[PDB]
Design a protein around this ligand. Structure first.
Ligand code: COA
Ligand code: COA
Ligand code: COA
Ligand code: COA
Lengths: 389, 389, 389, 389
């Protein structure tokens, strides 16, 4: 019915790294441009651009429209942003599918983008501070990483899952080190080459082309993982090593109907067979993928064992281990090229980021059935089922 | 197929007025609670809440979810926010409809919420300011009201439309005054009573219940409109009097299928027969409703003359006049109870706000066919067609 | 040897009151102009302007020079600012005296100015805040009212003196009320008329002439004083009522040698017979005046009983009582026209402010010997002995 | 009469370099401790500390007292800061000399300190910003480097002096290069070793001892100088190369009477024979040293040809050349060990900084008569004559 014709992502940048001063929409325009090129679709044929973005403060009116216009998508098209936290990037794709499914659009570019680096500090000053000190608020932490109900960082929700599922520091570290090793191997063997489009960081004393995931550490040791101090609980288990990072990037997919791709002679990256989103307790939001993946599979008519490949986002080693444990899918088909502990976690973009990695690995090993899933702050999960054509 | 079972909205607050220190999600919870109570639907039955919001900076993770959970919608449900600027509140509804149409939900609460009063000032300070002054940026102006492609206020786009359509200061002021006069008459006659749910502003030296639109001026004279200076062009035509204001409010609709409503014994407020969104030049974005409405009616199979009632959002008198002039619908069926010049423009809520006004007027006078439309910053428009059951 | 030929001050403004948006140098220029006029001395004859100022942040290069130049003091003369906190205003006069005594200058305009209202908030941001919230620092608190060695407000140092000297809440309130009643009586009787020069607050919809001390409250009851909550210690004795306020204002004196005034036919306000400055424990800085006055009286060769009039700055009721109690001078000859609890406490200007009060009262009642003294943050005191000619 | 018993300074740190995060008073406390040690005077014996500081915003109450107390000067001594911009450090010494000459003190530590790196950005926010963007004001530029009468940088005042004195780009560059070469030669020859006391920059992953001037560039070519673009006038002559920098540091001298050094068996670095300060046009403030030095020499009863050594502060190549040209002293005896273009310009400290350089060179070559002078923003200059014993 609805297919993914082409996809593309920027490299994921380190916090205040390669893309430290690059607005999100600049990354999404590059990505929008890339999916057009890959599909053989002209920007004039695009009906709407949908881009997940959790932290747009300061970047001006509707950055999704800014991206679309910059990529040369005509003014006649539309664009909008949405926010389901780390779910955003993938949810945008499901949302883009529904446009075509209900007959309101034919061609949709959908994904996510995020510049955690460029997120500003803020304060509400309209009423005026009569007297005393006031906080300038880091919008990345406030609006991206803090739970609104319990007031703690997502890492504390990772601790909740760890205790509940009795996951040791050592077990979380092994998972972490493994993510790094798989991603380093993938990177060196060229397996991110297909999915990555280069990004030119414009300069004044020179332009810089970034075409590699810079957050991936080389020769990651178990020792140096075990040496780290707990990051959120001074007698806790979750660390800066076994948690994902703060990162920048964008990622997208071009969607159309299966019959339309056939007319164009496009050979799609996959067909979207189903998706699902479900809520869980905020305190254990890392478990979101469990009901969300089960639901998606149920909608697809698939057994857990039918999946040949899986991308389950690594917000924290604690949560990823829990999800794998409960769902019980073959861990060897999961995050085959590493995950967000190594690659990075650009919130609004990660859902589309991990879709890209799924799609291109599926194609390269000739996998038929895949699933992509992410946990989401405030207690949600999202999943999507993809089949090869 | 898809019906609006119930709807509700807060009063619209004046900038730094009654809701000066009320977070947007607090207004959306009230609104969510009200649509549930009006439809005879319990919170536990809601699958997902979808709330438009352009300015959530500083408010924490996913305000849509905060709204939902405060209304007692269970943690198993999902929630997300979205931004198509002024289109957001109505687009959220069309997006809710599609969840049910594609069979992914049964019961959606959709609309918009906005606290322009509580929007913070900000600055990107990670790299640091080595030397020299920097700007603290008002996010309301930056992310709400400024065009990203030309750098000027929406008021300027309103200037652009006035010149293109040769609309005098005097004609714009006549419209402005009429809007106020219709809105005051409606207010005093009690015509907003049906659609408004009261909001309790919590206190410390006293709670305050707000159930009237406080931005509406009483005894608005033409004289006092004509005495105002131009706001965006010191030799211009647009003024604070003939533009919409800066405001606070939330508004929503509870969606389900027509067959579901029937099972429940609900008499819906209307059936969504169609919606549309289309792009126009950023410089003349006020003209967005023209193609968007024409498309929506084409999709509904309706003639312009088939509409019995119309809500066309008054972002500025210049654009509203241009929209009416081009579409040529009977201006006496348009904004019958007044519009945003009088009522106010809480950006991300406005589209569900004017849906509410359409729906309760349609019901009270027995109108069969209605249409709602808004212009959108950066050159877009959105429209939705509604028919009574 | 060295005489005060003339003197003048602005009225003392309330915090964010009449001088809410008035830079300090503007107040200082008015005061400079006033002392010239009163002495019959042309600006061109001035050698140097010395102005005390604790909170010049944001106002631009050397506000003392700005004040001098705007008062039409020629570009040949010199000007500088200096900081000994609350002792700055009176210290400037002593420093100006030394300029003439060492033979480096003939004519000096010395005093102090302060705009606590215009003091900005700040943050060091060159390094750049990589991540997390940061504080914007109210420089009035940080640089004006916080102890550098123990990190607490000057009201804590008043709490220290209160416990040490066993001064009750009731005793401090009796002193506070008395200061208000003496100041209101003086004001209505026109005893501040001679010292005050009016300041014109430039406006856009109208100019405003301020020539009365606005911080003096009329009909100050003991009841309303006793109803106030402790300000710095939630089981303490110091309050907003029995402490001085945050205030704006400027004050100065014109200095020359005794023989110079005689040549010019000027009848001076007083001769500077001596001065002194001494340190005490930071924790009990309010006690500064004790050693500083005893030193000054030793240098002047005076007994404490020789003083006919005294101005002992009321930073806090607790400290002012302690100073009076130790020194044991007649409390009826101290702060005859009230003090800073009623009049206000513009840190940099206060020293010269109370000098003016001392001088014009000395003249009107014909007092021969006078003394002015102030406690200084960080544990210091300053005093000056004056004799009429 | 009054002698400089000892002297010391920190190295001068580059902008955001070695002292990037070091509060000024910390550098002052080191310099206070140094001069005590060198003179063989105990901290207990000091009466008062005088420290010039132009940019103390954010550092708390009276940093002069913070320095004195950290250096172990007892709470019975007094301490204050002053501001005559670049003239402050040397003026402090003069002011300290007068304390002893007027009999109010015996032993004074006087000089200057500045952390231009630690100067914060600020904004007046009491009134509160109703709407729109507002500037965060860099207090370094605003209070340090901007003219309060004409509103342009000090580099523009240098442009005025250049045009006025017809000083070419090539002449200014030849002076700049020479300053860098003389300083580098002096550095390698160990001529700054005597005056410099090391500063320990406290750390967390290690302490760092700074004891060399880091702003001095090695191998300064005329080519690289001439390649630079104009800094303040896009068709101008002043550059970052031929102007002094933005720096951090501190410097002081211990003052006592001549007979007091003789009692103590101290051989002073010099006797302060005279000082002087005079104003000029703000537009051409760089000419300040001219009248100020001519006045000082007239007070000292010296001819310009009697001077054996001179320190004339190099704020800008343009002004320095003009001063040298007018006064016509032998340029080979001026800034023998280089100047501020090479060594750096920590505004408040420079006046005490160059005093040190003057003194320790006078001792090492056996010069009898010496002079120090600095231009001062807003059109002033200061100068002091020193004679060896
Ligand atoms: C955990 C977190 C707070 C850490 O932030 P941080 O302290 O600034 O990160 P840093 O890398 O600077 O600090 C960790 C230290 O451990 C080291 N480190 C990090 N990963 C390591 C690894 N895998 N092996 C060895 N050392 C490692 C770093 O080098 C650093 O030390 P250094 O500064 O000397 O180099 C942050 O990454 C985070 O909040 N991530 C979670 C995001 C999230 O919640 N996502 C949303 C959920 S869907
Ligand atoms: C126009 C706008 C900038 C307000 O500017 P402002 O001058 O700062 O606001 P004010 O209300 O104070 O305007 C000035 C005066 O107009 C007066 N005024 C406004 N409406 C009036 C009325 N109809 N009758 C008489 N006077 C009126 C106000 O009372 C005010 O009086 P004052 O000067 O004594 O305070 C703001 O309302 C706006 O930009 N809204 C546009 C909405 C928008 O861009 N929406 C997005 C597009 S979809
Ligand atoms: C103590 C301090 C925080 C109080 O300032 P503030 O809280 O902004 O003052 P407020 O207006 O909020 O005072 C609260 C109330 O107390 C009342 N109050 C204060 N002084 C009063 C008095 N003299 N008599 C009766 N009522 C009084 C006010 O009317 C006010 O009423 P409101 O809250 O309804 O407006 C402030 O003045 C301070 O830091 N003191 C400076 C003392 C000082 O150190 N001076 C320099 C020497 S080192
Ligand atoms: C002129 C001034 C504004 C320059 O500030 P700046 O723009 O930050 O200058 P920079 O340090 O960035 O210089 C730019 C580059 O030129 C080079 N350059 C500067 N001076 C040079 C010189 N002396 N020789 C060779 N190259 C030089 C530097 O290597 C620097 O390299 P970068 O690319 O890594 O930055 C600053 O020095 C200033 O405000 N002057 C102080 C004078 C003043 O007003 N103080 C009080 C006077 S009374």
């Amino acid at each position: 019915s609805i297919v993914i014709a082409s996809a593309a992502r920027t490299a994921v940048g380190s916090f205040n790294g390669a893309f430290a001063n690059t607005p999100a929409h600049e990354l999404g325009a590059t990505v929008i441009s890339a999916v057009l090129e890959r599909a053989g679709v002209a920007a004039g044929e695009v009906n709407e651009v949908i881009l997940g973005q959790v932290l747009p403060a300061g970047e001006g009116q509707n950055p999704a429209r800014q991206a679309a216009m910059k990529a040369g998508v005509p003014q006649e098209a539309t664009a909008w942003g949405m926010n389901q936290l780390a779910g955003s990037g993938l949810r945008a794709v499901a949302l883009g599918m529904q446009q075509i499914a209900t007959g309101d659009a034919s061609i949709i570019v959908a994904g996510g983008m995020e510049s955690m680096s460029m997120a500003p500090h803020c304060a509400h000053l309209r009423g005026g501070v009569k007297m005393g000190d006031f906080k300038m608020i880091d919008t990345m932490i406030k609006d991206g990483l803090t739970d609104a109900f319990y007031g703690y960082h997502m890492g504390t929700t990772a601790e909740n899952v760890a205790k509940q599922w009795q996951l040791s520091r050592d077990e979380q570290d092994a998972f972490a080190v493994a993510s790094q090793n798989k991603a380093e191997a993938a990177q060196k063997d060229g397996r991110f080459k297909d999915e990555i489009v280069p990004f030119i960081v414009k300069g004044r004393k020179g332009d810089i082309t970034v075409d590699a995931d810079e957050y991936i550490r080389h020769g990651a040791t178990l020792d140096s993982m075990a040496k780290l101090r707990p990051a959120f609980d001074k007698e806790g288990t979750v660390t800066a090593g076994n948690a994902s990072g703060l990162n920048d990037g964008a990622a997208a997919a071009l969607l159309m109907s299966e019959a339309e791709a056939s007319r164009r002679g496009i050979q799609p990256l996959g067909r979207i067979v189903s998706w699902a989103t479900v809520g869980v307790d905020p305190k254990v939001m890392g478990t979101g993928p469990i009901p969300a993946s089960r639901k998606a599979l149920e909608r697809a008519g698939w057994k857990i064992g039918d999946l040949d490949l899986v991308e389950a986002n690594e917000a924290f080693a604690a949560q990823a281990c829990a999800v794998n444990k409960d769902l019980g899918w073959d861990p060897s088909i999961v995050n085959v090229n590493g995950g967000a502990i190594a690659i990075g976690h650009p919130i609004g973009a990660s859902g589309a980021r991990i879709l890209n990695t799924l799609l291109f690995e599926m194609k390269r090993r000739g996998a038929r059935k895949g699933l992509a899933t992410l946990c989401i702050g405030g207690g949600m999960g999202v999943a999507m089922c993809i089949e090869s054509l």
